[PDB]
Amino acid sequence: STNPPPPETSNPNKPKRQTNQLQYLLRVVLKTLWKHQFAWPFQQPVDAVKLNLPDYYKIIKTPMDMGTIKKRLENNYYWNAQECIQDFNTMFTNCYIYNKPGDDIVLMAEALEKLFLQKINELPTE
Ligand SMILES: CN(C)C(=O)c1cccc(-c2cn(C)c(=O)c3[nH]ccc23)c1
Numbered sequence: 001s002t003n004p005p006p007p008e009t010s011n012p013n014k015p016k017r018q019t020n021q022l023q024y025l026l027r028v029v030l031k032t033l034w035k036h037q038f039a040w041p042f043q044q045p046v047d048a049v050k051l052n053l054p055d056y057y058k059i060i061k062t063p064m065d066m067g068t069i070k071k072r073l074e075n076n077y078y079w080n081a082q083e084c085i086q087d088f089n090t091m092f093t094n095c096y097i098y099n100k101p102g103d104d105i106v107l108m109a110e111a112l113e114k115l116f117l118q119k120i121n122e123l124p125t126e
Contacts, residue, residue, distance in 0.1 A: 009071035021081035026073040038108035
């Protein structure tokens with residue numbers, strides 16, 4: 001049928017910021033995940049039309065993807081690291097909620113999440 005509008009990657013009314021933690025999220029965390037062999041299905045919003053998932057956006061009401069996260073980081077959309085971490089967690093959780101356990105897309109998300117947790121374990125202070 002139709003996809004929703006994608007999550008915003010900028011907003012004129014939302015205060016913008018750069019912190020060293022946000023810089024680390026973009027240059028270390030996002031970059032490491034983006035190049036992973038399993039990253040590509042997560043590099044843009046789920047196209048429920050092209051993927052023939054007519055119920056995807058009936059079930060997933062807070063969609064999130066790494067393409068959106070990357071642009072948010074590039075645009076200084078976030079005020080703090082927690083906002084960005086929340087977006088990553090939402091992306092993984094959506095995949096686990098929508099898809100059958102043990103599906104390939106779930107295994108891909110699980111591998112990306114393990115790597116994500118490894119990199120955020122070293123998030124610098126401040
Ligand atoms: C063979 N693959 C993995 C694909 O053609 C492809 C491509 C683009 C996106 C997605 C996809 C992403 N996400 C996050 C899902 O939860 C999901 N469920 C079913 C498909 C997807 C799958």
